[PDB]
Every structure is written in structure tokens, then in C-alpha cells.
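Figure S7 source data.
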Amino acid sequence: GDIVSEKKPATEVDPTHFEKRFLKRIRDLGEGHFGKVELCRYDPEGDNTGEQVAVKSLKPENHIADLKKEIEILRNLYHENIVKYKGICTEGNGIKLIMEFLPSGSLKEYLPKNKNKINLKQQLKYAVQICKGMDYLGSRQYVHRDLAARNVLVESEHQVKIGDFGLTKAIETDKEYYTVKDDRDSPVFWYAPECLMQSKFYIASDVWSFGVTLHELLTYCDSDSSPMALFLKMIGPTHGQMTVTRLVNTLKEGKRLPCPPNCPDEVYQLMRKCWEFQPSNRTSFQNLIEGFEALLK
Ligand SMILES: N#CC[C@@H]([C@H]1CCN(c2cccc(Cl)c2C#N)C1)n1cc(-c2ncnc3[nH]ccc23)cn1
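C-alpha cells for the predicted LKT complex:
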């Protein structure tokens, strides 16, 4: 008789599924390590009225498994100071991470441009927000490993969010740290001594990175006062492959980044507590939250 076909089952729409054909590239936003982030418009109506989104894709060069792990981490993080997961675009092994777009960008471009409207009180409120997002990440047993002002996005003049989780790793249950094997592109000037010499990553190692991020915040991310520029002035700049060993020696000696210009000593002492040589001796994120809240009174 008649040709047999398939009964069409009801097709429910997934709001976290972004079709490639409607995901239109506007410009590059940033990049890091094996990935890149682009501003796109998701435009199913094809009239330029669609929502603007930030799209993470792998740089052509392996790392598919890392991007998929990052998607699964971000998809399950829900915090006011953590960039919002929106969905995915699937290829086919390929995948793209869809996040909310924050037009003000990172603190690295925002602070040098908005010094006049961002006073100490606002800088301390951003510090609290970063600590709150980080404490939430730590409570879910994750280490960020790339905490720097460059990875902090501006939602508005009054709110910041951790904007990238490209290097985020889980800590094991009944364990205290993550062991790194791939360290070639490490942001060494933001790293705790245990990360540089023993390749161990603790929640206390993220507290060290926060201390350096706080210093950047207080210097309005000025390029000439950057953690890299300051440490290279301290140890020497032209040392090539000997730079990390010279940095470790400097930290063992008790030397640290100086107090930023116009930064009060009470704020500098909270920053120094992030830089205790032993991780067990360092301040916690909750203690930092209470320290800043006390200065905001
Ligand atoms: N945060 C941040 C800084 C960079 C990203 C860019 C990639 N990057 C990485 C870093 C390390 C490892 C890896 Cl694997 C990567 C990768 N990939 C950092 N950035 C994001 C925006 C941005 N701007 C507006 N809205 C946004 N919504 C989400 C993000 C976003 C602008 N610059």
C-alpha cells in the first residue's frame, strides 16, 4: 500500500539551545589560553532585534573535554557575582558556551576609564562582591586558578561578576587541593608559592590571587602599577626562563607588592593577610568579607 513514514512527536523548544544559523558574530570580546569569547546577537527573527550574548568557542589548535567541563560547572553555578550561563550551541563533537553579555567589560578596561566615579567605598564593595562569588565557588568545592581583575566583569557601577571559568577545577571530596600538570601558561604573578613550586592548588591559593586582584582594584588596573610590572621591577625583567625561580626566592624572603598609592593601611593589612606564605595561615573569604564590611561602616 501507501509509503510508511514516522509519526511526528511533539517538538518542545529548549531555551538553553542556541541554533548556529541564528547566532550572528559582532566582534571579539577577549581570549585566554585555548579559548576565545565573542559578542554575538542571537537573531532568530533576522531583523537585528535579538538578544546580545557572549559566546565562548575553542581557538583552532584537544580541549573540547575542558570546554564541556567548564559548561557543566557554569550551568550549575547560581550567584549574583558569577556571570550567567545562558546555554549552548552544538555542532558533531563541537560546542560553544553561551553566557550573558556585560557591555561595561572587565575591570581591566573599566577602572582606568572610570576612576573619577569609583571611590574607595566602591572599590571595597567590589572587593566584597568578588569575595562572595569566590566563597560560593569554594563552597561547591572548586578552585578558580585565574583570579585577576582581567577576569572580573562590570554588570553596572554598583555590581561586578567573575566572568570566566576557563581554568576552574574541582577539588576531591576529603581532599584540600588540585594537582596541576599543565602549567605552561600560568599567570605566575598572581600565584601563591605552593602553586609555583609544588603545583598544588588550594582554596587558600585562590585567596592569594584575590589579594593580588585587590591590589589591581586599588591601583585602578593601571598598566604601570600592574602585579607583573611591580614584581619584574623587584626581581629583574630580562631573566627569561629564570623569572619564576627569582619570584619564589623573593616570596620566601617575605617581600610583597607595595601598598597602592592612597590605599589606607587598614585595607593594605587585609591584602597582606591573603599573602601569608603557608596556605593554612592565610585569611578566608568570609573573614575578608567581614573585614571589608567593618571598613564600610
Ligand atoms: N572574564 C573575562 C575576561 C575575558 C575572557 C575571554 C576568554 N578568557 C579566558 C581566560 C582564561 C582561560 C580561558 Cl580558556 C579563557 C577563554 N576562553 C577570559 N573576557 C570576557 C569578556 C566578556 N565581556 C562581556 N560579556 C561577557 N560575558 C562573559 C564574558 C564576557 C571580555 N573579556
